[model samples]
Target: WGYGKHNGPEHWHKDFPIAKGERQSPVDIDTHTAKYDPSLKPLSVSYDQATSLRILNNGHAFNVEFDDSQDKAVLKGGPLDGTYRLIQFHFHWGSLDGQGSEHTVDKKKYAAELHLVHWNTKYGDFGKAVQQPDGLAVLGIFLKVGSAKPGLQKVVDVLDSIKTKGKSADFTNFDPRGLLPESLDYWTYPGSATTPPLLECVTWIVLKEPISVSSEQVLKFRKLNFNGEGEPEELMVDNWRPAQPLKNRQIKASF
Candidate 1:
């Protein structure tokens, strides 16, 4: 059940059928000519216990969900209003040496991609957010394998806690904000979820910079499973899709 390059993204559903209908996020991003808007203000985010958070082992990937009533950030002037709820966070990686990430930058591919999904609290929840053009805001971070990456260490340390299939460890008193990079500068664009129903209402904020993690750390994530219980180990070696075609969409960068 080891998923290598030959049987990676195409065969993900074989292990976890739910992934087949997931509203996936894209990876590699290239040729963004939209100008940066200096007047745009950054949103304020706070980490506190008021936030109802939970970590889940979805059989395919490790996901974390945060409640909007808790330490949620609010957007002032933009395509969105009210508070945004941190829905879930997940990772996408490659199987083989060459191809792993979905969004390519200048035709260059990274080792993996991480998405922090958020929904407009003005709406009811993520389910309702997906239907509106300004409903969701996903923060994307690119990951490259190298000597060492401190940012990834937090998640790696907990691998053993959720090693077996259908197993998940609760991360209480843990602050999810630490996973973010120091710089918040990003690129913004409008696109549909990479996976079908292909809902086209996501406002993507892709970080211009990528974080580095050691090859050893990357190995830990590669060992993920796709089945809940009694299922053979379907090594999530590669869990990324090829970059999708941009159908006349303009991307904006934050200065």
Candidate 2:
């Protein structure tokens, strides 16, 4: 669903029954209680900087689609049984600077959240992979408002080109890895996609560190309109879903 009062996160369960599923995502990460798992290996993200195809405003969020035709870019180790191909990466933000992140640390909300969506090659393709339990692995990076981020500027510079929904622009040779924090240390768990069709097939790898973005950069994100070219002026903001119940899941920390 859309992020309006009529069809937002609270109302998603009415249409998508899995919104109430056991492995729901974006849970409040209680850091003090998380168990440190030495068994988890370091994450290996080998990305081809030239694989970026285009950047588009898809009503929900701006996404940078990648050409995952072969094994050009993939994620290995750390909670995954096999290599997971990088398909696309998108963000979730809010109307204001104080809030936006889907997954919070001890109830601490950040300015935004970045999701790097990857699918297991073992499942063949993204369409079929997203349906299996061990099919997807998502790398979640938290964004905080601070000094201007050079990595994020690459995206902000192209925001004006895609100010409305369903608009896209050529965004090539961009390295997605530039957006990550220095530390790969993270907390991971079993969860679902934060958006609609909320499939419970994701292995959530949320980085412990957060990347910095300027207040001006974040304002550009709000400039995007959820409505198309001539529609009403509904700014695209507060697109993040609230944290779900922890239930029977236990978070594992990789330090």
Top model by TM-score, which number?
2
Q: Write the per-residue lDDT of candidate 1 for residues 78-169, one digit (tens) a residue.
A: 33355666766788777754556667777788888788777777778678887787888777788887658665676788876776566777
The lDDT of model 1 is 0.65
Least accurate stretch of 10 residues (summed lDDT) in model 2?
44-53
Top candidate on lDDT is 2
User: Which digits, one per residue and each the tens of the lDDT, describe model 2 over residues 51-93?
Assistant: 9999999998999999988998899998879999999999999
Which regions of candidate 1 fall more than 4 Å away from where they truly are? 1-28, 48-52, 71-81, 96-98
Q: What are the Cα lDDT values of the candidates? A: 0.65, 0.92
**Per-prediction TM-score to the true structure, in the order listed:** 0.79, 0.98
Off by over 4 Å in 2: none
